[PDB]
Amino acid sequence: MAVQISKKRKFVADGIFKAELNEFLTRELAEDGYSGVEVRVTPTRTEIIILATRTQNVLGEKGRRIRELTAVVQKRFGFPEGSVELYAEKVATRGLCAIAQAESLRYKLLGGLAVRRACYGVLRFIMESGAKGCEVVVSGKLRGQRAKSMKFVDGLMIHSGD
Amino acid sequence: LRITTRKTPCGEGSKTWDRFQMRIHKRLIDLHSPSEIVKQITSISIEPGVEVEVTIADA
Amino acid sequence: RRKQHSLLKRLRKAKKEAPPMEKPEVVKTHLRDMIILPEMVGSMVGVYNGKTFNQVEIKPEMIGHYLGEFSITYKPVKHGRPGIGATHSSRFIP
Amino acid sequence: KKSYTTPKKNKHKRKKVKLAVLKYYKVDENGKISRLRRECPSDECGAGVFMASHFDRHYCGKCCLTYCFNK
Amino acid sequence: QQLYWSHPRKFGQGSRSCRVCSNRHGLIRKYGLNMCRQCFRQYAKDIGFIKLD
Amino acid sequence: MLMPKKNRIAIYELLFKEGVMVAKKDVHMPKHPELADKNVPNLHVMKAMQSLKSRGYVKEQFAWRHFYWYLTNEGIQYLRDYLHLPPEIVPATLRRSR
Amino acid sequence: KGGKNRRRGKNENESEKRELVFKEDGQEYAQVIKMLGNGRLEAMCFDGVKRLCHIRGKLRKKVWINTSDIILVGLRDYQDNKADVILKYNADEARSLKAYGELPEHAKI
RNA sequence: AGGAGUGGAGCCUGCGGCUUAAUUUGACCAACACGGGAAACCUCACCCGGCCCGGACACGGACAGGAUUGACAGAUUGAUAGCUCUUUCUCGAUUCUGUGGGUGGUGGUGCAUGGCCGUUCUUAGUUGGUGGAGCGAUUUGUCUGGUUAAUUCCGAUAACGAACGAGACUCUGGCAUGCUAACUAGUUACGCGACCCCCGAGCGGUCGGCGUCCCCCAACUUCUUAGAGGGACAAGUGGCGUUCAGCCACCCGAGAUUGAGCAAUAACAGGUCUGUGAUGCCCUUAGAUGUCGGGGCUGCACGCGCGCUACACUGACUGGCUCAGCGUGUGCCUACCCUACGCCGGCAGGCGCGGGUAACCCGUUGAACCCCAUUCGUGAUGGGGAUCGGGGAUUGCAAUUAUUCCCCAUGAACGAGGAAUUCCCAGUAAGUGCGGGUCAUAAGCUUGCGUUGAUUAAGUCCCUGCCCUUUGUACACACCGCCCG
């Protein structure tokens, strides 16, 4: 159980764990209203706070899904056994959570629905929830086999500076 | 940490690059006191993601 | 000896069985690498190029060299008649 | 990239001939069992399998790199 | 079956592989990368870096 | 074969115990370390899970050169009868998550 | 052309080389005699019969057929005097066909 | 206005053409030392041979004297591939065989697409609401004028009140004897004792000078390090301007511009299916476009581009002196780092020991140009180092079409370069070295960094091009347009 890697390499390996997880989860919790994570190592314990809007579908009946997820991480990155501990979290104010708003629009569209009315519906929600402004783009095909672009915009926006 | 790499995949067009940087910071406070009360008080009262490494002796 | 074994036994063998005052048939190789040595002399070896086994007799004057120097793997080159765009003039048609 | 051009041979895997099975034990009277050729002597061999009667070659087929007598 | 399937890969551009899918061509090692320059860009936002200069 | 009959058991039994399997995409793994201990010299995990997945009984994710196979209820019934196990045993997990 | 522009909006290209129908029934090799304008053109067939050749869609402004050279021509099902161009070849392709001994050995390039 | 070059010569490298069994392929201001693309194998998409299935699943067939598996030797074979054949054991329902159905592909289509990037465009541009003006397309707002680097402000006003870009912002440089605190950073002070030379007063001691060990329970934080703060605002003065917005000079001093990052609307049939387990459709899929061995991407009568080294005396050569910075480093990928010190060798190098997770060890980075003293003498010379012979080392499984490095010998073009053309305004150009990137071995490349450090300008619309207004048009695929005999 030693020694330990250089301080320069210490941050890179943390970043790789922070990033890989964040795309692992997005391919499973897409329908559950995923919105991110926030990792924290704590004394002799890992915390992985799995942020999603509806904790219901994440939990499952008898906590099956959360049990699957913990057993995965325990084998995959070769964690010492029983150190890993998951936690869930529900976010309040869901219209500032761009990641979830975009991935909700996805399943509305892929569910089979018109584009204009769908874009309007998501727009007023993120405006209502609080926001100076907001924007939506849909680039690709529709009504033939040449591509187009469709912008739906309301309020303020910024594009330059820090 | 510097990383100086292409901004264009599949190089074409005017030749451009992109400087990325990460800045680490180190600093250390030396105490001399019993190792118990140190290891007690140290590990608690930390809100952010910031690392700490306790050493037995150095001097 | 990294399984050059296969070559060196066939050479001595074929050299032995062959009639006196006559050379053997051939042993073939895809190996273009192996030092020419005194014991190898008198044998006849075909050496793969990209498709073709160019046969060569081994001389005592070739010792030290490799096999692959005595078999070429390209046509020497001929030309040519410069083509069209072969310069800052070729262009236009309609 | 382009499609395969005609060969003038290809044959894949041999059919590993459809021999009659167990005549390796010979019965002429009971309870006697008339064994032919010796059963394989290695520790890792079980010595319940027969060795090949392959004269001018004598080879255990359970082994696959070792134990080849020839006389 | 066969008695071979492989041949020495111990150094060179074929014995290291980059993490796109086992992609190559795009020789990479830096500071413990093993990470593909096209996707490195997409992880400018993700942690490891935030662009500041 | 396709693979031995020993090495089947060692995958199907190991899956039943953790409730989940994971592996990497390679074909030059020499003995497959990182459980199944030193008796899978080839694909075998990936090749046997895929056939199992064809017939349902499991779900499969894939992300950054790593598989993740999630056992399901239907496969628990199958594996339970297939390996001649008690009519109520799940050693993978069974408790309420708080 | 000599470079220019607006010549990329549209499908570059080229002949990645390639190969090789004939003749078929009423679909054979001819040589350009003249080079009229407007669009049509002249071309004597290799058999001995003359005919007047006509351009075909696509090949319009997508392929220039300079004067003199082999070219693939369909014959009209009923018409003798006028015939219909197909499928041109390459000058290299035409000398390979000549070396094979399939078209008559009479015309030079 | 000038500075240094390119085009000329030799060499490196990319591109075209030609050759070839294959010489894989994209790209034509905004391609061409570009695809991290400096290819021994691998890579690898190409060409030629050989092997394997890693053809799920379903249904039917086969089938426990049995579906099936593997292999010695001999022959064959590049092969020690049971690949094939001879020979005859071995494995045991995992299979094989037929049909249906999948799967893989650096296969095709960037003119089916996502994403990203480049470019129009480094300029100052851009839009809706309500009202006004028009049958309407539209227009006003977005302006005659002054002013600014800037649609920046002042002002005018059938418009009024707003938004995006500009600016603001972030990083970096320049100003702290103020603040905060340091044996993984220093300085000073002695305590010193030790070494050294009288070198200076004196005698050698001491006082002074030279560095190192000794240094502390010494003192301090100027130097070094990195944090919190302050400082610059056209602030003050003199001119000029409507005296408005601003502009010029000067004091103080760091002068209102040190350099980068971020960057709008709309567009392109721009690049990329060979970054993508992003993706449509089509193709191919057992005689495979999915694996091992060998060859090729380096092949030359030629054309072009990016660069490197040179044509000497403001130099070369041989000794001597003396200064730096940004970084990086084994414990990582799968077998591998940076090196001090000792010993051996002319050199490349070998060998023995030790440290370094790194303001801790390499490294007080004891670098080059430059500086100081010999030699050569205007000579294609000792300038130049191309070509080429022989020999010695290192990396690797393998070094041939010479991987790289070293030693001796050989000693070419070239003696300042046509028509043309590129780039640059202050620690800037130019000269000069170094670190990082690719890396088993190896930069003439690219990306950063220090060191030495000029001449010329403080302008203009002449050329090339861009922004705004007015005007004309048979143009709108938009002058690379249209059209006549």
- The secondary structure of A55-89, three-state, reads HHHHHCCCCHHHHHHHHHHHHHCCCCCCCEEEEEE
Phi, psi of F36 (to 5 degrees): 0, 105
A48 in helix, strand or coil?
A: strand
Q: What was the structure determination method? A: cryo-EM
Structure tokens at A90: 């529900």
Round to the nearest angstrom and report the end-to-end CA distance of chain F.
Answer: 46
Confirm whether residue F69 is marked as ligand binding: no
Domain that holds residue A32: 7-90
Helix (H) or strand (E) holding A110: helix A98-110
Helix (H, G, I), strand (E, B) or coil at A40: strand
CA–CA gap between residue A70 and residue F20 (Å, rounded): 10
Q: CA-CA distance, A126 to G25, in Å (whole number)? A: 70
Report yes or no: F45 and F32 within 8 Å, Cβ to Cβ: yes
Torsion sign, CA atoms A4, A10, A12, A13? positive
Domain residue extents for chain C = 1-81
**Total number of domains in chain G:** 1
Single out the residue of G5, G76, G91 nearest to residue G45, CA to CA. Answer: G76
CB-based contact A9:E32 (threshold 8 Å):
yes
Q: Where in A106-162 does DSSP place strands (E)?
A: 133-141, 147-155
Ramachandran region, residue G77 (left: φ > 0; alpha: ψ -120 to 50; beta: rest)? alpha
Nearest by Cα to F13 from F35, F43, F38: F35
Residue type, F57: Y
Range F19-43 burial, b when 16+ CB lie within 10 A, else e: bbbbbeeeeebeebeebbeeebebb
Cis peptide before A121 (omega within 30 of 0): no
CB of B39 less than 8 A from some CB of E: no
Helix (H, G, I), strand (E, B) or coil at A133: strand
C-alpha closest to that of C24 among C9, C14, C13: C14
Instruction: Find the domain containing G5 and state its range.
Output: 1-109
Which of strand H's nucleotides are less than 7 A from any protein C-beta?
Answer: 16-23, 26-32, 34-37, 41-54, 56-58, 65-73, 77-85, 87-96, 106-119, 163-171, 183-184, 226-227, 260-272, 274-277, 284-285, 287-289, 291-296, 299-304, 327-335, 357-359, 396-401, 436-440, 447-448, 477-478, 480
- The answer to whether the CB of C57 falls within 8 A of the CB of C33 is no
- Tokens, residue A65: 């899904």
Q: Cα dist. A99→A35, A126, A153, A156 in Å? A: 6, 12, 17, 19
CA–CA gap between residue C40 and residue C27 (Å, rounded): 11
Q: Per the structure block, which two tokens stand in for A150?
A: 């469709």
Q: Judge: domain E1-53, CATH 1.10.10.60.
A: no
Could you tell me how far CA C71 lies from the centroid of its own chain?
Answer: 3
Count CA atoms within 13 Å of residue G21 on its CB side. Answer: 13
Residue of A11, A17, A37, A38 for testing the chain B interface, max B β-carbons within 10 Å: A11
CA pair distance F47, F33, nearest whole angstrom:
17
In whole angstroms, give the CA distance from residue F65 to residue F24.
6
The CATH number of the domain holding residue G69 is: 2.40.50.140
**G52 and G36 Cβ atoms separated by less than 8 Å:** no
Residue type, G75: L
DSSP state of C69: G
Q: What is the CATH number of the domain that holds A78?
A: 3.30.300.20
Going by C-alpha positions, the residue among A63, G38, E51 that lies closest to residue B2 is: E51
